[PDB]
Design a protein around this ligand. Sequence first.
Ligand SMILES: O=C(O)CNC(=O)c1c(=O)cc(CCc2ccccc2)n2[nH]cnc12
Ligand SMILES: O=C(O)CNC(=O)c1c(=O)cc(CCc2ccccc2)n2[nH]cnc12
Ligand SMILES: [Mn+2]
Ligand SMILES: [Mn+2]
Lengths: 336, 336
Amino acid sequence: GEPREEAGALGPAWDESQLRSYSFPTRPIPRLSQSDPRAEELIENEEPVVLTDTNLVYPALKWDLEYLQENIGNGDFSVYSASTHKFLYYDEKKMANFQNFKPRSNREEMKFHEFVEKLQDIQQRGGEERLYLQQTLNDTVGRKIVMDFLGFNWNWINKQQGKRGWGQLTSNLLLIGMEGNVTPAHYDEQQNFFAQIKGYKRCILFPPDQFECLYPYPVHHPCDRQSQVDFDNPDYERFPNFQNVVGYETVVGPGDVLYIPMYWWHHIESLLNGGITITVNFWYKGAPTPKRIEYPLKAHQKVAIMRNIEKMLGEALGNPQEVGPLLNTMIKGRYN
Amino acid sequence: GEPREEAGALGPAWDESQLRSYSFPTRPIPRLSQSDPRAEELIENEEPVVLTDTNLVYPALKWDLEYLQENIGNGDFSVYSASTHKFLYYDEKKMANFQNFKPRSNREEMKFHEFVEKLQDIQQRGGEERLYLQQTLNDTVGRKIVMDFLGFNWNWINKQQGKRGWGQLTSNLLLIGMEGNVTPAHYDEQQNFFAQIKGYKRCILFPPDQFECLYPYPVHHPCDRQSQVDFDNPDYERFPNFQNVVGYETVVGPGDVLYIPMYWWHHIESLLNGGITITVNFWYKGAPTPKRIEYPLKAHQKVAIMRNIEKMLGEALGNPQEVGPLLNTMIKGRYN
Ligand SMILES: O=C(O)CNC(=O)c1c(=O)cc(CCc2ccccc2)n2[nH]cnc12
Ligand SMILES: O=C(O)CNC(=O)c1c(=O)cc(CCc2ccccc2)n2[nH]cnc12
Ligand SMILES: [Mn+2]
Ligand SMILES: [Mn+2]
């Protein structure tokens, strides 16, 4: 809501002009201490919460481009490129299903200084071209970064994994972005802790029961799990229920950790004119489904049922492009 | 097409005024000898054919109400009743899913003479109330009927079952109806030989790829497999593709045998002012599906896929009434 004040009378951390304007209402995600019972209650009920004092990535709070470039080593890093502010990721494996899909984002491997220089050059000419670096925190990075990575609050996050009954830590991703970068609305099938390090990022989350308002791509499409709605220019004729969507909103800064529950939609943007952003994400496999299914189902279980129906139909028909026509055949004049 | 002539200059077997008028075009089903290779080719390709000389139910050609009443015995027979000419059958087991479904047909058990008398009484007062008797040909009927039943051309129909690779003979049903009786359009999941004995019945068949034009009820509805379209007063707003339906038509009389392939729609009506009708149906389980599935699929395989999706969805959601809403959720703004 109202912008927080940096310690030491350093002024507001951000102002309203750094947030993009959208067509839907939002309400705040709770900001709570990790020792607060309400925070544990929210995570257990699969609702989002911002924890302000986990110290989850404390040793990484000194990370910037200068520190990382000298200590991360001389390895190759995956840099994603976009022509606009919207980063449009896609699944290359599913490109065969949609021969007319034209990719808008592009990946490239380079050294860290190549990433820094291409970053600085774009800011110099102001070319509106934006970049996103993604890298796994393992032993392939330099020694000093490994020391920092080992210094994460593994005690806290291991206990969270234990208490919630989650599966194994799937991925631990370092994310470095440019001001204005937007990852459009999408949902994931894993639990996530979103650990902010440098700069500020506005996170807008939508519950799984907003499926009907957000219109995800077909499961076999390369943009599977992403919303088809252009938040900047929504097509109300194709997507009429986008007029009904309501989100949960928060701005996370250094030291904050946001819990993004599995199947929850999230739209993440780096604040305009806010400098670079650095985030470390942790993803965990969800807990195994309880063997005594309790009716009526939760929204996220209906999402999984719909995903499976689309998958099985694509295999049974021998061609995922026939999924749509058959589903319409099933419905028209029978269920609508 | 043109009405056939009875042997012995006995005049046309029927005239056009005995056929009900419908809104769709039709073309004739081939009438062929059972020794004709074309007939074997049609049955093997799952296309309908009228065989004129099988002698399948030859000993039953002397069956009428007087002969049957004296020789079928003093057992109970299932008599279905309808207020109009349309016999609206339903699955009582599925009535729990649709508490607002009101049955229009009614079943009652009675002696054969009770059936004859209630038949004659309705014709006397001309009450437009119509009846349909259904009974399995087994050893529970009288001795003389068993002799006749044993006299069917079991050699011919056993060889057909063998050649097509069909499963076991599921049911062998005696059907006695009144003039004007209509069994509305529906499809079955078994192979059928329709053996006409007394009177004439107009059979209108639609291929399985007419699913989209005939709008079957939801699988969990008591009228599962039946068309929702009132052929007498079609609702083109609810059922727009009924304007595109095209049928295969024939009038079968004594001695004729119609092959109704599995998943083919059929609408059967006893000719107006044509007297009672008598039919014996034979149903067989279809051949096991070939283990090497050949793409793209046949229409009837897509029907089975759609049926299974509706079934599994009803079980997964714990309530078949939620099938419709979820299917719409899956489709709207995504596949339509
Ligand atoms: O913070 C922001 O701006 C928003 N970014 C994201 O949500 C985000 C992301 O950045 C990176 C990955 C890749 C995760 C992965 C998958 C397979 C193997 C390794 C790693 N995913 N996956 C789902 N969401 C993301
Ligand atoms: O000739 C006409 O007027 C049209 N009639 C029919 O299509 C017709 C019929 O009459 C009777 C039965 C019941 C079959 C059955 C099912 C389970 C156990 C025993 C028997 N079916 N089933 C599917 N279609 C029929
Ligand atoms: Mn994500
Ligand atoms: Mn039938």
